Design a protein around this nucleic acid. Structure first.
Lengths: 433, 432
DNA sequence: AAAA
DNA sequence: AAAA
């Protein structure tokens, strides 16, 4: 899958010129048709400001205005119609109207928008054109694009290209070259944020104290997230710290996450007052970092959902999950920890012993010296700490126990053990931020 | 230490407006004084396109012309004397001149320029303004800033703020708000890319390929990296994978890296052909990714230079280094591995035993026929693998061995061991 | 806790 | 809001 994103300003104010790209040449007011010809994308994404709209009779009338205007422009230029248009919440006081709100709303809106567009299965080749864009929309789109591709890179190969044209001077210009200003193999960056406090999901921009308190107080998200917070932070830490069993046991509910993001996005959408007479759009609620963290969390869940399996978790399963999620010394320490339990399972099996629901400490034959559960031992042993994990060997007739022990040996956090791991991994994720 | 960086285009064509920022107000043509007034920066940086240069005699009368007119404009609105001015190489075909070259040369030049300005000690509060910026220069300056602060974040606390004002619209404009577009705690990202092939340090933009090969041949830098490439990638791997002994032993020569960069820099600049009559700059050499990696490598070395402790490398010193350099699970892995060697060294000290110049396998007491050095065992055991490391205990009169053993127990790689580790860590960094 |  |  190849993906072309373009940051656009006011497209009706652009001059006809000549564009050079990949040896091909193009006459027109936009870089898009030559970008599509050369790159041949599987899908195109256009990101432009809300401020281009010229109708204030409704918020949806303001977006059907801007959309139709873009649909005309794509016909004027040789551009296709396989396109998604993201109408981002823009700021300022213009000749044809006024738009107030948090400037950071565009980041959270575009992040949320791109989250539902960027494919969650297979490799990504992403092309970003900034020739036509506004400074602050372009930077926040670049940032929102990168942050998601960083989570995509955990499971899949992600190459990122960025283009800007030669600068346009009124009449000195004859041909503009479309230059590659970036070419990057996106590094895998799993989410390393804790869920923030319940002030930083939706904030009041221009709203009376009592009215905001009623909206905030009405949200199912904040009520639910209060109790679900620790487990989601335990899962976030599972990817970051190299804990393959906690990844599986703490895999989040995608439906519930989808529910939280739609609820907040809708409260924000509904809190936009479009004053039809005096041509003013006021976004009376602003998105917080908490909304951003949730969007990223659900994206990481979608990216990695294919690894999840049913409740009996074998050492062979933890091996394969680990080889996908982890790299470098994190991966190799996990393989050594699974290896030590595997090699012990093999010894038991040679003797015709198949222990069931036994603590890992009793499985590996530890001393009675330490039963306390430290962050040191939890983090250092890929979360397979001796005092929290329970082991069960399903019985079989061994002929080559070296290769069949892995499938028949299962690991499980004790109900007490899981809560000790949750506290440690949650606290460590919050202390590392 | 608070830092302020601003992205500027053509600073003359801006009109008088007033600005609102953080419970203050200001009148003038740029946001810099009201930013300085609220932010209270210990230093200011200004990144410009060199395309605004008018007098074309040669390169020093372009970086003069622009620095002249920047310093005139900074007297007009009282920006003070605490300012650094980066005249980044721009491209295009303009009213008063023509600048040709690679679009990406601005990134590497600003990266290089920023690598020498940004403090390499103490916490950082970086403030960034995109109000006045060109499209590409602002985007590359932003990326250049983030790439360096990510490495700075390894050792210090780095908070980053970005600003862009309400859009200046000439009719119906009363006052523009300085909007905060970004506020983030910068995540520690240690350098995680190998040094490339000796192709991609300088590339010919507009140089006949026979001339480039001649020039690439006269560079001492590429001939010196030929040797060092592996030993430097091993050091890069040391930070990324949590290998504290390899970090100390492979610690790069800063004076030497300084001389590589300055040579690649002054070579690039010496291949800029200015033509006074045609009014045309041409940057015949382009900066490659290899130049960027060397600047980032040097910056990471400056950031972590304080940790290069005096020899020999004791368990106590390795703990101290590790406690500063590593986080999360990687730190605990390293602490557990130093704890294994420490606890053994205590058991030895109790019996009155102080082994000297002993392989770590013999120190820990290992079976035969596990002498093959696997990537698995080097990366998984904080690079302290039993077949590559040599332990020494300087004999002492113990009183509390549990406290004393850490100081008196030294670790080093065997001459053969270090090359296998270098090979393993270099290879692991390339598969990335 | 690698060959507690 | 193709160099506020």
């Amino acid at each position: 899958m190849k993906l072309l994103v373009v940051s656009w300003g006011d497209f009706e104010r652009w001059k006809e010129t000549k564009y050079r790209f990949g040896g091909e040449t193009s006459v027109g007011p936009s870089t898009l048709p030559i970008l599509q010809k050369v790159i041949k994308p599987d899908w195109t994404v256009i990101v432009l400001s809300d401020t281009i709209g010229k109708d204030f009779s409704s918020v949806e009338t303001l977006r059907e205005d801007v959309r139709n205007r873009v649909m005309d422009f794509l016909d004027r230029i040789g551009a296709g119609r396989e396109v998604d248009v993201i109408i981002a919440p823009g700021i300022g006081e213009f000749t044809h109207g006024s738009f107030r709100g948090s400037a950071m709303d565009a980041y959270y809106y575009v992040l949320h928008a791109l989250s539902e567009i960027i494919p969650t299965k297979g490799d990504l080749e992403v092309h970003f054109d900034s020739t036509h864009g506004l400074n602050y929309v372009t930077l926040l789109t670049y940032r929102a694009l990168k942050d998601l591709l960083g989570i995509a890179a955990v499971m899949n190969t992600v190459t990122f290209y960025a283009y800007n044209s030669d600068p346009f001077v009124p009449k000195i210009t004859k041909e503009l070259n479309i230059n590659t200003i970036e070419t990057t193999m996106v590094k895998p960056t799993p989410l390393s944020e804790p869920l923030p406090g319940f002030d930083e999901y939706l904030c009041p921009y221009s709203m009376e104290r009592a009215e905001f308190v009623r909206l905030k107080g009405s949200l199912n998200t904040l009520k639910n997230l209060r109790k679900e917070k620790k487990k989601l932070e335990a899962w976030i830490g599972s990817l970051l710290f190299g804990l393959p069993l906690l990844f599986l046991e703490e895999f989040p509910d995608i439906g519930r996450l989808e529910s939280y993001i739609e609820e907040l996005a809708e409260t924000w959408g509904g809190a936009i007052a479009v004053n039809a007479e005096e041509k003013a759009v006021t976004r009376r609620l602003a998105f917080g970092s908490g909304f951003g963290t949730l969007v990223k969390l659900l994206f990481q869940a979608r990216i990695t959902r294919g690894l999840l399996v049913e409740e009996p978790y074998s050492i062979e399963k933890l091996y394969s999950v680990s080889d996908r999620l982890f790299r470098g010394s994190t991966l190799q320490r996990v393989r050594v920890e699974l290896g030590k339990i595997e090699d012990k399972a093999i010894k038991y099996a040679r003797k015709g012993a198949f222990p069931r629901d036994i603590p890992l400490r009793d499985f590996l034959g530890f001393d009675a010296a330490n039963r306390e559960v430290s962050p040191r031992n939890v983090l250092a042993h890929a979360g397979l700490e001796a005092n929290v994990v329970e082991v069960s060997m399903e019985a079989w007739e061994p002929k080559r126990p070296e290769e069949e022990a892995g499938r028949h040996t299962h690991l499980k956090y004790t109900p007490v053990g899981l809560k000790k791991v949750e506290d440690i991994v949650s606290r460590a994720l919050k202390e590392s931020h």
